[PDB]
Design a protein around this ligand. Structure first.
Ligand SMILES: *[C@@H]1O[C@H](CO)[C@@H](O[C@@H]2O[C@H](CO)[C@@H](O[C@@H]3O[C@H](CO)[C@@H](O)[C@H](O)[C@@H]3O)[C@H](O)[C@H]2NC(C)=O)[C@H](O)[C@H]1NC(C)=O
Ligand SMILES: *[C@@H]1O[C@H](CO)[C@@H](O[C@@H]2O[C@H](CO)[C@@H](O[C@@H]3O[C@H](CO)[C@@H](O)[C@H](O)[C@@H]3O)[C@H](O)[C@H]2NC(C)=O)[C@H](O)[C@H]1NC(C)=O
Ligand SMILES: *[C@@H]1O[C@H](CO)[C@@H](O[C@@H]2O[C@H](CO)[C@@H](O[C@@H]3O[C@H](CO)[C@@H](O)[C@H](O)[C@@H]3O)[C@H](O)[C@H]2NC(C)=O)[C@H](O)[C@H]1NC(C)=O
Ligand SMILES: *[C@@H]1O[C@H](CO)[C@@H](O)[C@H](O)[C@H]1NC(C)=O
Ligand SMILES: *[C@@H]1O[C@H](CO)[C@@H](O)[C@H](O)[C@H]1NC(C)=O
Ligand SMILES: *[C@@H]1O[C@H](CO)[C@@H](O)[C@H](O)[C@H]1NC(C)=O
Ligand SMILES: *[C@@H]1O[C@H](CO)[C@@H](O)[C@H](O)[C@H]1NC(C)=O
Ligand SMILES: *[C@@H]1O[C@H](CO)[C@@H](O)[C@H](O)[C@H]1NC(C)=O
Ligand SMILES: *[C@@H]1O[C@H](CO)[C@@H](O)[C@H](O)[C@H]1NC(C)=O
Ligand SMILES: *[C@@H]1O[C@H](CO)[C@@H](O)[C@H](O)[C@H]1NC(C)=O
Ligand SMILES: *[C@@H]1O[C@H](CO)[C@@H](O)[C@H](O)[C@H]1NC(C)=O
Ligand SMILES: *[C@@H]1O[C@H](CO)[C@@H](O)[C@H](O)[C@H]1NC(C)=O
Ligand SMILES: *[C@@H]1O[C@H](CO)[C@@H](O)[C@H](O)[C@H]1NC(C)=O
Ligand SMILES: *[C@@H]1O[C@H](CO)[C@@H](O)[C@H](O)[C@H]1NC(C)=O
Ligand SMILES: *[C@@H]1O[C@H](CO)[C@@H](O)[C@H](O)[C@H]1NC(C)=O
Lengths: 175, 328, 328, 175, 328, 175
C-alpha cells in the first residue's frame, strides 16, 4: 500500500497472532514473547466499521414505479420504458463497481498506515537506545527484561533510564 | 542515573500484523483480485421464494387480474371493496365474462393499482325508457346468464331507445372514478335489435373533458359464444364537477363510483407463494432482505429494497492485505 | 569551527497546527460527523421569493394561461404577438370564452411554450358560401358576444353550407403553426340550424399528414351558457408544403399562422412576484443564486441552476481536523 | 488521518495561533515564543481552494424540460415522467453525497500530510543536533538563541556550525 | 571486522526520479491542469467516416426507407425478404407509389426494425365478390399502373361490394405481423364508384384485440395525381389466435404475414458510405474504435461502443509528476 | 503529492535518466555515475497499468435503443425522449470527469509514494553509516567504491562491514 509497511518492510504477517491485528514479538533476557497491540487494532477496526456502516446506510423505498417486463410488442413508448430502466441499471452498476474499488483501495492503505504509525510511534519512544534493523524489528541496546518490554508496549518506557547503557553499548568501536 | 551493571546485552522487539490462512480476493483501483484478510458481500443475490405477508397489505389476486376484479367478473366477486398495498397478479388468472377490451388498459391497471382501493359506491342513476340489467350467457352468474357486477347493460324499452342524458354531481370532496363502456355489436341486426337506432353514440363529459365513442359493428373471433365486444373507458370527476352521460345506444352504464386515494399501493405479477413472515422488500421472486446495499435478484421491487445492480457479487474488504508466512 | 564555549545549554522547538474554539462537523468516508476547522455549504436551500425580471424575458401571464393567450380569449388580448423566455402561468388564471377542450393539451402547451413567440400572421383565407365571424354570448368581446380573436366560426349562408375546400401554400422558408377546431353541438337541432348537414366533418391535411375529425353531438355540462364544446387541433406546415382544409360543417377555421421558432423558451407555473433584479436560475419558488453546485429549493428550474438534490445541507470541509486545547 | 501527525503524535492544536495553519512554538535562551509557518499554510490553503473551485465549477443550464408536477391522473405516460425525474434525482443525490464524503476524507489527510511534511522537513535540517521528543517537539542540543530559531524557521540553519557542540552535548555519558 | 585503513573518505548517494522535457497537463482533484510525464486519451473523438460492413449485417436502404421496403413500393422491390442487423436509412430516400400515411409510423418503423427480417409468407386469403388486385397510376410497376407488392386493393364487382368477413388462424408457433390499410377517397363519388356503399368500415380483430377504422372522405393535396390517401395499420397475431377481417368497403387487404423475430436488429439514419472493414461500434458518422472507454463522436451508436460523453478530451495520467531540471 | 518526495524534498527530476523511473546518482572516490532502479520502476508501472486496464475494461454493447434525433415537433412524448437522453449524458459526463480527477490524483500520490519508499528503503539499509543531507542524498561516511555502491543498489550492502569506520568518521569532534 502507500506506506510500504504491510507487504513492504515487514516481509509477512503472523498467522499466529489470534488476539489482534497489529502487535509485537520480542526476544529479551527473560525469554521470547508475542502480544497484540489493542490501540492500533481498535483504530483499524473502528475506521473499517465506520465505512462499512456508511455503505450499509439507508435503503430508499420505492412503491409504484414503471413496468419492467412486457408481454406484447408496442413500439415507441415501450422502447422508452425499456431505455429508462436499462440506463438506470448501468448507472447504478457503475456506481457499485467504483464504490468498492475506491473503498477497497483505501482500506488496504488505511491498514498499511496503521502498521506504519505503530512502528513510528514505537520508534520515537525508544529514542537513542535502539536501532532499526529495517525489517520491522528494533534492536534494543541495553538489557530489557520482560517488564521493560511491557513498558514499551504499554507506552510508558523511559528512555533516559537506559540511555547511558544503550548509548555506550551502541557506539562501541571494536572489530 | 542507575549504577554500572555487570551484564551487557541487547533485546529484539519486532512489530508485525496478523494474517489468516484462507483470505478473500477483493477488487481494487489498481488490482482486479488482491487478497485481504476478510470481506463482506454487498450484493444480495437470493430470494426466499415466498412473498412475506407482512408489513405490507399483500392482496393475492388468485385467478383474478385487477381489471376483472374492478369490472366485477362474477368469478372475481370476492374482491369487492378490497384494499391492498400490493395486489399480486397470478399468471394462472383468467377472465370469464363478456369479451371486453380496454383501449389503454395499461393506464387503467396503473391508476387503479396505485389507488389501492376498490371501494365502490352505488349511485342512484335513473335510466328512463330503457331496459336495465342486461346480462349474457357468456358471463354466467350462477345458473343464470349475467354481466360485470359494476356495469349496467342498457337495452331498449319497447319501441324505443331514447336519448339518455343524465347527470351526477360530484358534491363530495374527493375524486370519483367512473368506469363505463360501449357495446360493439357483431351485426347490423344485433344493433337494431338491442338499441333500435342503426348507430349508437356515447358522450361522457365533465365540465373540463369530454369523450365521444361511436360503436364499431363487425364480426370478431368467438369468445364465450360472442362475436361482439364491449370496450371499457374511465372518467375521473373532481370535487364540485359533474358527470353528464348522453347516449342514444350501446351505452354500458356505470353503477356509481370507485373512490380514488393517494397511497403507496402498486401491483406486481408474481407466482411466488405468500407466506407468513415479515420482510420489507418484495420482488416477483419472493422477498429478499435489505441489509445489503445492492441486490441482483430482480429489477422489479416494492418496498425498502437494495438498488438493483448487474453484478452478482461485490465484496467490500473489511480487513488488511493478507500476507501469510507459511501460505497453504 | 568556532571556539569552545563557556556555556552549555539546549533549546526546544515544537511544531504544531492551529485549532478553533467552534469548528464544524463534516461527513467523511469513515465518519458520519467529524469536526473540522471550517467548511462550506454546497446545497443552496433558500429562494428570495421573487422571480427576477433579468436576464431572461419573463412574461407574466397574469390571469391568462398560454393556451388562452394563444387562442385569443378576449380577456387575454393583451398578449397578442408577445414573446418570452419564460411564460409564467399564475394559478389565479381563468378562461372566459366559449367552452373548448384541447385533446392533447399538454403537447400544444409545450410546443408553443418552447417556440416562445405568439406572432400571428393573418392569411387571406376565402370562405365561400358560409357566414363568417360567428361569436357567442359565452365569450363577450365588449358589450357584444364574441369569440377567440384567432379562430373564425363559420356558420350557414342563407339556408345552406357548402363543402369548403381551401388551400394555403407554405411559400415562406419557415414552419407555420395553424390552430383550428371543430364544434360539437349539444343537439341535432343545433347541428342542422348552424351547419345544415346532420353530421359535419373536418379534414386538414398537408402532403405529409392528414387528420379528419367528425363532431360529437350531445349534452355536456353548462359552462357559460353552453352545452356545446369546440375542440382545438394544430397543424404545422413545413416550407414548401400546402395546407388543405376540407369541411362540410362544424369547422372553426384558422385566420392565419403563428410563427414557430427554435429557442430556449419554456413555461413555468409560479405565483412568485416578479421583481427587478438579475438572477439566472429561476425556480417556481423565486430565483436562487447559482454559486453552489447543488440546490434543494425546487426540482423545477429554468436557466443556469444548481443540480437539485435531496439533501438540504452538504458541507465541504475547507479546513483541517479541529483538535482544541482550551476548547469552547 | 493517514499520516498520524494531526490528532496523532501532535496531541492537539493551538487556538492561540491566529496567523497561520502550521507553525512553531519555541523555548530558548531569551524566552518563549511562537510563529506561523507561511509556506506550509499556503500549501494547505492552495490545495483546499484548488478542490473548492473545481466543485464550484460550471453550472449547466437547462431550459424547456419535462413537467415535474401534475394536476390530474393520467396513468402510463405520467407514471414514466415521474419515474425519469425520480431516478435522476436519486442519482444526483448519491453523487453529491459521495463527492463530499471522498473530498472531506481527502482534505483531512491532505492537511495531516502537510503537518507531517513540515515536521520532516524541520527534522532533516537539524541533522545530528536535535532529537525528537516524539510529541512534535525537537530538543536542540546546543545553545540556540532567537536568531538560531529564526534560521531554522526561515530555513537557512547551518547544522555544521553547531554540530561539535550539539554532538558532544548529546552523547554525554553520565548519570 | 576488517583492519584500520590508511584512507579516510566519504561518498554521496542521491536518489531521484526521471522527468521528460515535454510532459502533458492533466486534471486532478485539487488542480485543473498539472503536468505529468505521460497520459492517455480516454475520449474517442473521431470517426473513420465509413460504416464498416463487418461484423454486423448492415443493409443499405439506398433510396428506400424501411416502411416502403415493408409495404412494397415497386422501386423498393429489391428488399423482399431481406434481413439485417442494421438497416441504414439514407436521406436521399424517396417514396414513389400511392400516397399513404401511417398513424404511429414511429412504432411500425421500430417494431419492424427490431425484428430484423422482412420474410413474407403469402397466405391464401379468399376475397369473395370483390375485384382483387387494384393498382394506380401513382404507383407504376413497369409501364402499368400498380400498388404496394404486399397489399391487395379490393374494389367492387360490377354492381356490389359485399360484407367481407374472413379468417386466418395462427396455427404456427410464432407471431405473425399483418400489415393492412384503409382507403380514404377524395370525393363521395369516388367512394361510391369504388366501394358502392357511401361509407366503408374495416374491423380487424384477434380474440384479444380489435380495431375499427372508418374512412375519411375529403380532398387532400395532390401527390402523384392523387388526393386520396391510404393509411397503414398493423396486427400481430400470437400462436393459436385468429385474425378476422370484416369490412364492407375501403379495405386494403393483407396478402399474408411478415415473420417476427427477437433479435439485435435496429435501424439507423446515416449517409455514411459502407466500406469493407471490421468494426464493432457504428455511429451515424461512420464506425469508431472501441478501445477507449468514452466517445464523443455521436450519441447514436449501435454495437460495442464507448459511453458517449460531452467532453471531447479526458486524459488519464499514466506517469508521475514532471518536474524538469530547468522547469518547463 | 502526499508524501512530499517528488516535487518535494527532491528538488527536481533528472531528464537524463532514460532507463527507469526512479534511480541513483553517486559521487565516490572512483568517480560519479547514475543507475535506474528497476524494482521501484516496475512497481510504479505495474500499478499504473493495473488501473489503466480496469478503465479500458468491458464496453457494454447496446442495439435497438430510443431515437435521439427528430424531424418534426411532437410535444409531450418527444420532450420525454429528449429529457431521458440528456439526463443520461450529463450523468455519464459527470462520471468520466470525476473518474479521471480521482484517478490522476491517486497516480501522482502513488508515484510520490514509490519515490519515498525507495528512499526509506535505502535509508534503512545504510544504518549508522550515512546521514541524510535532506535533499534526497545520503552522505556515506566511509570509503565506498563502485562495488560498495552496487551492493547498496542491488540491496546486499552489509552495514556491519563498515560500521566502525563510518561511525568513527561520523562522530569526529574537531573544528
Ligand atoms: C365471420 O367469420 C367467422 C369465421 O368464419 C365466423 O365465426 C365462426 O362462427 C361459428 C358459429 O357461427 C363459430 O362456431 C363455434 O365454434 C366453437 C369452438 O369450436 C363452439 O364452441 C361454438 O358452439 C360454435 O359452434 C366459430 O368458432 C367462429 N369462428 C371464429 C374464428 O370466430 C363468423 O360467424 C362470421 N360471421 C358472420 C356474421 O358471417
Ligand atoms: C341534459 O342534462 C343536463 C342536466 O340535466 C341539462 O343541463 C342543464 O341545463 C339547464 C338549462 O336548460 C342549466 O341551467 C342553467 O344553469 C346555470 C348554472 O347553475 C344557471 O345560472 C342558469 O340560471 C340555469 O339554471 C343547468 O345548469 C344544466 N346543468 C348542467 C349540469 O349542465 C341539459 O339541458 C340536458 N340537455 C338536453 C338537451 O336535454
Ligand atoms: C380542393 O382544393 C385543391 C386546391 O385547390 C384542389 O387541388 C388541385 O387540383 C388540381 C387538379 O384538379 C391539381 O393540379 C395538378 O397539378 C400538378 C402539378 O403541376 C399537375 O402535374 C397536374 O397535371 C395537375 O394540373 C393541383 O395541384 C391541386 N392542388 C393541390 C394543392 O392539391 C382540389 O382539386 C380541390 N378538390 C375538389 C374535389 O374540389
Ligand atoms: C506498564 O508496565 C509496567 C511494567 O513494565 C507497569 O509497572 C506499569 O504500571 C504499566 N503501565 C501501564 C499504563 O499499563
Ligand atoms: C469480516 O467482516 C465482517 C464485517 O466487518 C464481520 O462481520 C466478520 O466478523 C469479519 N470476519 C472476521 C473473521 O473478523
Ligand atoms: C362497499 O362499500 C360501500 C361503502 O361502505 C358499501 O355501501 C357497499 O355495500 C360495499 N359493498 C360490499 C360488497 O362490501
Ligand atoms: C428472479 O426472477 C427472474 C424472473 O423470474 C429470473 O430471471 C431470475 O433469475 C430470478 N433470480 C433469482 C435469484 O431467483
Ligand atoms: C471557510 O471556508 C470558506 C471557503 O474556503 C472561506 O470563505 C472562509 O473564509 C473560511 N473561514 C475561515 C475562518 O477561514
Ligand atoms: C402581429 O404581427 C404581425 C407581423 O408584423 C402584424 O402584421 C400584426 O398586425 C401584429 N398584430 C398585433 C396586434 O401586434
Ligand atoms: C419551494 O416550493 C415547493 C412547492 O411550492 C415547496 O414544497 C418547497 O418546500 C419550497 N421550498 C422553499 C425553499 O421555498
Ligand atoms: C534567516 O534568519 C537569519 C537570522 O537568524 C537572517 O540573518 C537571515 O537573513 C534569514 N534568512 C532568510 C531567508 O530570511
Ligand atoms: C504513455 O502511456 C501509455 C499508456 O500507459 C503508453 O502506451 C505510452 O507508451 C506511455 N508513453 C511513454 C513515453 O512511456
Ligand atoms: C420470401 O420467403 C418465402 C418463404 O421461404 C418464400 O415462399 C417467398 O417466395 C419469398 N419471396 C421472395 C421474393 O424471396
Ligand atoms: C458526427 O455527426 C454529428 C451529426 O452529423 C455532428 O454534429 C458531429 O459533429 C459529428 N462528429 C464527428 C466527430 O464527425
Ligand atoms: C551486488 O553487487 C556486488 C558487488 O558490489 C556483487 O558481488 C553481488 O553479487 C551483487 N548482488 C546481487 C544480488 O546482484
Amino acid at each position: 500500500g502507500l506506506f510500504g509497511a504491510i507487504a513492504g518492510f515487514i516481509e509477512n504477517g503472523w498467522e499466529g497472532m489470534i488476539d489482534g491485528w497489529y502487535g509485537f514479538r520480542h526476544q529479551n533476557s527473560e525469554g521470547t514473547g508475542q502480544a497484540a497491540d489493542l490501540k492500533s487494532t481498535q483504530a483499524a477496526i473502528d475506521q473499517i466499521n465506520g465505512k462499512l456502516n456508511r455503505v450499509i446506510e439507508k435503503t430508499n423505498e420505492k412503491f409504484h414505479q414503471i413496468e419492467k417486463e412486457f408481454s406484447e410488442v408496442e413500439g415507441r413508448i415501450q422502447d422508452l420504458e425499456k431505455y429508462v430502466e436499462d440506463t438506470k441499471i448501468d448507472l447504478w452498476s457503475y456506481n457499485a463497481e467504483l464504490l468498492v474499488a475506491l473503498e477497497n483501495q483505501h482500506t488496504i492503505d488505511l491498514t498499511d498506515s496503521e502498521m506504519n504509525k505503530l512502528f513510528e510511534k514505537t520508534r520515537r519512544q525508544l529514542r537513542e537506545n535502539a536501532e532499526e534493523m529495517g525489517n520491522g524489528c528494533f534492536k534494543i541496546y541495553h538489557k530489557c527484561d520482560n517488564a521493560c518490554i511491557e513498558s514499551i508496549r504499554n507506552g510508558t518506557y523511559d528512555h533516559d533510564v537506559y540511555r547511558d547503557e544503550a548509548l555506550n553499548n551502541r557506539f562501541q568501536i571494536k572489530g | 542515573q542507575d549504577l554500572p551493571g555487570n551484564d551487557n546485552s541487547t533485546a529484539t522487539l519486532c512489530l508485525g500484523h496478523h494474517a489468516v490462512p484462507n483470505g478473500t480476493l477483493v477488487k481494487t483501483i489498481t488490482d482486479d483480485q488482491i487478497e485481504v484478510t476478510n470481506a463482506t458481500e454487498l450484493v444480495q443475490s437470493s430470494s426466499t421464494g415466498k412473498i412475506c405477508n407482512n408489513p405490507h397489505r399483500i392482496l393475492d389476486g388468485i385467478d383474478c387480474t385487477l381489471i376483472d376484479a374492478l369490472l366485477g367478473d362474477p368469478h372475481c366477486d370476492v374482491f369487492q371493496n378490497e384494499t391492498w398495498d400490493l395486489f399480486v397478479e397470478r399468471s394462472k388468472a383468467f377472465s370469464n365474462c363478456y369479451p371486453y377490451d380496454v383501449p389503454d388498459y395499461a393506464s387503467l391497471r396503473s391508476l387503479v393499482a396505485s389507488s389501492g382501493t376498490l371501494e365502490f359506491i352505488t349511485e342512484g342513476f335513473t335510466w328512463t325508457g330503457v331496459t336495465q340489467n342486461g346480462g349474457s350467457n357468456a358471463c354466467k352468474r350462477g345458473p343464470g346468464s349475467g354481466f360485470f357486477s359494476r356495469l349496467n347493460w342498457l337495452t331498449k324499452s319497447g319501441s324505443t331507445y331514447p336519448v339518455l342524458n343524465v347527470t351526477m354531481p360530484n358534491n363530495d370532496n374527493f375524486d370519483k372514478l367512473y368506469i363505463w363502456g360501449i357495446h360493439h355489436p357483431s351485426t347490423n341486426q344485433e344493433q337494431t335489435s338491442l338499441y333500435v337506432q342503426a348507430s349508437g353514440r356515447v358522450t361522457v363529459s365533465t365540465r373540463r373533458s369530454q369523450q365521444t365513442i361511436i360503436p364499431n359493428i363487425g364480426s370478431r373471433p368467438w369468445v364465450r359464444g360472442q362475436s361482439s365486444r364491449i370496450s371499457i373507458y374511465w372518467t375521473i370527476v373532481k370535487p364540485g364537477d359533474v358527470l353528464v352521460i348522453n347516449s342514444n345506444g350501446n351505452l354500458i352504464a356505470p353503477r356509481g363510483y370507485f373512490k380514488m386515494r393517494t397511497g403507496k399501493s402498486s401491483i406486481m405479477r408474481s407466482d411466488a407463494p405468500i407466506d407468513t413472515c415479515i420482510s420489507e422488500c418484495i420482488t416477483p421472486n419472493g422477498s429478499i432482505p435489505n441489509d445489503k446495499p445492492f441486490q441482483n435478484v430482480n429489477k422489479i421491487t416494492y418496498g425498502a429494497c437494495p438498488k438493483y445492480v448487474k453484478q452478482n457479487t461485490l465484496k467490500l474488504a473489511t480487513g488488511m492485505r493478507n500476507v501469510p508466512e507459511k501460505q497453504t
